[PDB]
């Protein structure tokens, strides 16, 4: 599923926030699938994300 575009975004998201894909996706959706906000998204909450979602990032 998902559109190769949104997917690629997940990659950048999992390669920029690296907060675990599954979760990163949670961000790809909780971020309106923007990007800039996505990134910031991770860097946003950064106070509730677990160790499972945040993998060394």
């Amino acid at each position: 599923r998902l559109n190769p575009v949104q997917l690629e975004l997940l990659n950048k998201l999992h390669l920029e926030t690296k907060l675990n894909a599954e979760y990163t996706f949670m961000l790809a959706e909780q971020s309106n699938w923007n990007y800039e906000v996505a990134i910031k998204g991770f860097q946003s909450s950064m106070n509730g994300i677990p160790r499972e979602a945040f993998v060394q990032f």
């Binding site: 979760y23 949670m26 961000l27 909780q30 971020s31 309106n32 923007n34 906000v37 996505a38 910031k40 998204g41 991770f42 946003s44 909450s45 509730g48 994300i49 979602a53």
Partner: peptide, 9 residues
């Protein structure tokens, strides 16, 4: 799990 949020929604 889920229900988590990022960018100030």
């Amino acid at each position: 799990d889920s229900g988590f949020s990022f960018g100030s929604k």
